[PDB]
Amino acid sequence: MERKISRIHLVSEPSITHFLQVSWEKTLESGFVITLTDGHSAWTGTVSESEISQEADDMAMEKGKYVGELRKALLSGAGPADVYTFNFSKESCYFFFEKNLKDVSFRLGSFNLEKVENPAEVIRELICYCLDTIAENQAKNEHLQKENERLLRDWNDVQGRFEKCVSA
Amino acid sequence: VDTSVVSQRAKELNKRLTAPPAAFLCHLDNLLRPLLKDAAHPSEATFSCDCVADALILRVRSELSGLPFYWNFHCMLASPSLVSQHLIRPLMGMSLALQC
């Protein structure tokens, strides 16, 4: 159950930041669950294999490249290649993201989310998983720093012993 | 072709390509010029020809920033005046100049 939380500036409100949590079980191809939040409400949606397949063949592209672009947009793996823009109507619950280049827009994808009655639990789950990853990363880095120090010390020792060996 | 059917054809062949005719034509010119000027150096473009009835469909496929770009030139047999002034008279002029 891989997860990824990203920050997107919705076109409707430029200054305000919206947060986008995408989760997939095995791989992004099989489908994913998306949750868009802003702190006061959450909108949840699903994309199964059939829907992504329909999107891929309807656009008439190779499925692998479509998945690559979808990951570069949703998962926030974009480089300097080119920019994306997202749109989301609150009274229609119709999210859609496109790739903008040279004033030319490509409607890369469109999902239909739906309002969830209880936003407090989703927000709390987001932050709790976030702090869990925080703590796990701290633990891993602290553990590996000790291995770093051990490696440096052992290298110093063995270098000294090689110096003695060559001198003798 | 002028700037009234360009948008129609662009939207028909690309259901999610919301661009003005100017940008589409600029992209087409950029795609076509390197091939015409120099023989297939870029090699990014793909061309196909279909002859149905008296018309000709020239399909051009390209990768606009890695995304599909389809175009279809619909050509009808040129009038006698156009073919004349484009091929016949110029060639006679060239022959006369070479003889001189």
UniProtKB/Swiss-Prot annotation, chain A:
Consequence recorded when altering D82E: In SSMED; impaired ability to repair DNA double-strand breaks
Entry's Gene Ontology molecular function annotations: DNA binding; enzyme binding; FHA domain binding; identical protein binding
Presence of keyword Ubl conjugation: yes
Chief location bin: nucleus
Cellular localisation: Nucleus; Chromosome
Residues in the signal sequence: none
Modified residues (Phosphoserine): S53
Ranges where the record places region Interaction with IFFO1: 1-168
Keywords: Chromosome, Coiled coil, Cytoplasm, Disease variant, DNA damage, DNA recombination, DNA repair, DNA-binding, Dwarfism, Isopeptide bond, Nucleus, Phosphoprotein, Ubl conjugation
Record-level GO cellular component terms: cytosol; DNA ligase IV complex; DNA-dependent protein kinase-DNA ligase 4 complex; nonhomologous end joining complex; nucleoplasm; nucleus; site of double-strand break
Cysteines paired by S-S bonds: none
GO biological process: base-excision repair; cellular response to lithium ion; double-strand break repair; double-strand break repair via nonhomologous end joining; immunoglobulin V(D)J recombination; positive regulation of ligase activity; protein localization to site of double-strand break; response to X-ray
Outcome, altering M61R: Abolished interaction with NHEJ1/XLF
Modification after translation, per record: Phosphorylations by PRKDC at the C-terminus of XRCC4 and NHEJ1/XLF are highly redundant and regulate ability of the XRCC4-NHEJ1/XLF subcomplex to bridge DNA. Phosphorylation by PRKDC does not prevent interaction with NHEJ1/XLF but disrupts ability to bridge DNA and promotes detachment from DNA. Monoubiquitinated.
Tissue: Widely expressed.
Chain segments annotated as coiled-coil in the UniProt record: 131-165
Protein family (similarity comment): Belongs to the XRCC4-XLF family. XRCC4 subfamily.
Disease linked to the protein: Short stature, microcephaly, and endocrine dysfunction: A disease characterized by short stature and microcephaly apparent at birth, progressive postnatal growth failure, and endocrine dysfunction. In affected adults endocrine features include hypergonadotropic hypogonadism, multinodular goiter, and diabetes mellitus. Variable features observed in some patients are progressive ataxia, and lymphopenia or borderline leukopenia.
Record-given protein name: DNA repair protein XRCC4
Taxonomic lineage of the native organism: Eukaryota, Metazoa, Chordata, Craniata, Vertebrata
Curated annotation (Swiss-Prot), chain B:
Region: Globular head, residue numbers: 1-87
Subcellular location: Nucleus; Chromosome
PTM section of the record: Phosphorylated by PRKDC at the C-terminus in response to DNA damage. Phosphorylations by PRKDC at the C-terminus of XRCC4 and NHEJ1/XLF are highly redundant and regulate ability of the XRCC4-NHEJ1/XLF subcomplex to bridge DNA. Phosphorylation does not prevent interaction with XRCC4 but disrupts ability to bridge DNA and promotes detachment from DNA.
Residue list for modification Phosphoserine: S84
Substitution effect: F69D: Abolished ability to participate in V(D)J recombination
Recorded superkingdom: Eukaryota
Known outcome of mutating R89 to A/N: Does not affect ability to participate in V(D)J recombination
Site feature (Leu-lock) residues: L67
Phenotypic consequence of F69A: Does not affect ability to participate in V(D)J recombination
Note: Was named 'Cernunnos' after the enigmatic Celtic god of hunting, the underworld and fertility.
Role this protein plays: DNA repair protein involved in DNA non-homologous end joining (NHEJ); it is required for double-strand break (DSB) repair and V(D)J recombination and is also involved in telomere maintenance. Plays a key role in NHEJ by promoting the ligation of various mismatched and non-cohesive ends. Together with PAXX, collaborates with DNA polymerase lambda (POLL) to promote joining of non-cohesive DNA ends. May act in concert with XRCC5-XRCC6 (Ku) to stimulate XRCC4-mediated joining of blunt ends and several types of mismatched ends that are non-complementary or partially complementary.
Record text on subunit structure and interactions: Homodimer; mainly exists as a homodimer when not associated with XRCC4. Interacts with XRCC4; the interaction is direct and is mediated via a head-to-head interaction between N-terminal head regions. Component of the core long-range non-homologous end joining (NHEJ) complex (also named DNA-PK complex) composed of PRKDC, LIG4, XRCC4, XRCC6/Ku70, XRCC5/Ku86 and NHEJ1/XLF. Additional component of the NHEJ complex includes PAXX.
Descriptive protein name: Non-homologous end-joining factor 1
Species name: Homo sapiens (Human)
